[model samples]
Target: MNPPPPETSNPNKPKRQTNQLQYLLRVVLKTLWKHQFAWPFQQPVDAVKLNLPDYYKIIKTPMDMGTIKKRLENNYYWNAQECIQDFNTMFTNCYIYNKPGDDIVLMAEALEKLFLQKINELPT
Candidate 1:
C-alpha cells in the first residue's frame, strides 16, 4: 500500500509575493462589476497569462472596449469608473494586508506605478 503521497503544498496558503495572475483576474472582475451599469470598453478579453520565473513579461493587446460595454449592459449594467474604484479598493486592501513596513510602502508606491502601467497602461 502506498505510504500516502507526500504532503502537498497548501494551495490556500498565500504566496510570499502576490500572485500576479490572481491579482489580474480579481482586478478585471472588480472592474467588470463596477461597470455593470455602463462599461466603457468593448470586447474586453478575459484572457490572462501566467509567465513564472520570467523576470520580464509584457502584455500588449488592444481590447474591444465596446464589447466590454455590451457585456455589462447585457449582464450587470455596471459603470466603468465604478469598476475602477472597486478594483482600486481591492488592490489597496491587499496592499495593506501584505505591507511589511514604511519601506514596503515606498517600494509598493513605486511598484504600484509600474504594475498599474503594465496592467492598464494607465498613468501610475
Candidate 2:
C-alpha cells in the first residue's frame, strides 16, 4: 500500500512546487495515451460503437485515459496513488468484462505492466 503518509514534521518539505502532481500525472499519461496496446483504453468504451451493449451494466464506473486528462487538469490528484487505484479499476474492469483468451485481456496485462514500470521511473 505505498501510502508514504508519515509526514516527518515540516522543515524537510520540498519547496512548494506547482504543477507537481497534476502534470506529473499528465506526463505519465503521455506514454499511455500513445501506447500501442493503449487503443482500447485511450478513449471511453463505446457501448454503441462496437456493440457491447451491456458494458455499462457490467461495469458502472468507467475511467478512460481521455477523461483522466480532464481530472488531471481540474482535480490534480494529491498523490496519484489515487490514480494507481483508478488504473487498477480500469484493469479490473477489462479483466472482468473480457475473459481468458481474449486479445483485450492480453493487452490489459501488458498495459498494466507498463503503468507500474513508468510509475517507479517518475519523481517521488
Candidate 3:
C-alpha cells in the first residue's frame, strides 16, 4: 500500500529547522512518558497533561527514519505543529484499518522498518 504523500516541500520554514520525525518522536515519547507508558533515562518527570486523542495519535504513529531523513535533508517549520498534525493523520488512519490483535509495538516496528527500507531506496 502507498504511504502518505511524500513531503517534498515544507510549508513552514526557518524557525523550525529540525526534522519532522525527530520532532514528532520527541513529542510522542514525551507523551508516553507522561502517561507512564514509557520511562526515560531511569528518571520520572511530571507527565505533560495531554488530551487522550493526541496521546493516542502519538502512540499509533511514532516517527520513522524516512521522515527524519527528509526533514533533515530539507529543513522545515520552526514550530512542530505540522509534523504533529501529519503524525496524527498517519496514526489515526493506521488505527482504523489495523486488524484485531494489533498493538502499538507492532505498529512502531512497522514504521521503523518502512523508514529504513525507504532510506535504502533513496539515491545518495
Highest lDDT scorer: 2
Between prediction 1 and prediction 3, the one with superior lDDT is 3
Q: Which ten residues in a row have the lowest lDDT in candidate 3?
A: 37-46
Off by over 4 Å in 2: 1-20
lDDT of each: 0.36, 0.69, 0.41
For every model shown, the clashing-pair count is: 17, 0, 3
Task: Give the candidates in order of TM-score, highest first.
Answer: 2, 3, 1
What are the per-residue Cα lDDT tens digits for candidate 1 across 3-114? 2221223345332322433333345444543443323222222323322222112212222334333333333222344334433543353344345555534543544454
Clashes of 1: 17
Ranking by lDDT: 2, 3, 1
In candidate 3, list every pair of residues with a backbone clash. Answer: 15-78, 16-77, 16-78
Error of 2 at 14 (Å): 21
Q: In angstroms, how far off is 44's CA in candidate 1? A: 21
Report how far off residue 80 is in candidate 2 (Å): 1.5
